[PDB]
């Protein structure tokens, strides 16, 4: 049902209906010799669209666009970057040109310009300290503290019940760790346990990559880390 490397040619973008107005966009890249899936969140609010991460470069973001006018038909008019990697920021560009107004926290914008990569516009406030949430038209944001990376954000659609995770939560097939070069390893069991305490009524948890799941997600993401940590 969920859509998987093999049904996405790179440069396609699938979209698949998690509940009344709530999607995730899947995208894929290729990566020293593998294919990596990557999933973002689209969100309606009344007649406008908010977007949670590009898809992951110029070409796939513009193929996203594509597929929500296709599918969905209504104007994104708004986008959030969840942390300032390639995969969330990487596409920046092409809603910009598009005249989406796209946003990220100040730390997020900071560390994307260190990293000469792309940069949302506005600055997110009201989420520099962990445990902090803000609510961003149909979401809400929160920030659990430094996991994945110190600036990581997660999204919560109160209406759904739907937990975005980002790169911070692992889905289950992944039993070692990622590419945790900017991560805090030391705080991201912590963090995941903010997430816990704040959203324990989620029913749909969706990980920055691969199959959603449940809270579940949240634990098994703690025990890669740990293992990680203890190598
Ligand atoms: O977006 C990036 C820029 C990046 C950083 C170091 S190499 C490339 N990387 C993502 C990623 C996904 C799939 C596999 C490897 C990855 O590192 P990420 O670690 O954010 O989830
Ligand atoms: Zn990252
Ligand atoms: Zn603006
Ligand atoms: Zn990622």
New binding site residues.
Partial sequence: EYPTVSEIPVGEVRLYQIADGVWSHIAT?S?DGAV?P?NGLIVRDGDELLLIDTA?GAKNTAALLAEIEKQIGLPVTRAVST?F????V?GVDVLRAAGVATYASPSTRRLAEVEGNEIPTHSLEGLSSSGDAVRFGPVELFYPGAA??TDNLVVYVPSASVLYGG?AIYELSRTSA?????ADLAEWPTSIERIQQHYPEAQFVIP??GLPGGLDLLKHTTNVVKAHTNR
């Fill in positions: 890249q990566f990596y990557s992951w942390h990697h390639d995969d969330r990487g994945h990376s790169c990622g590419n945790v070069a900017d920055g990559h």
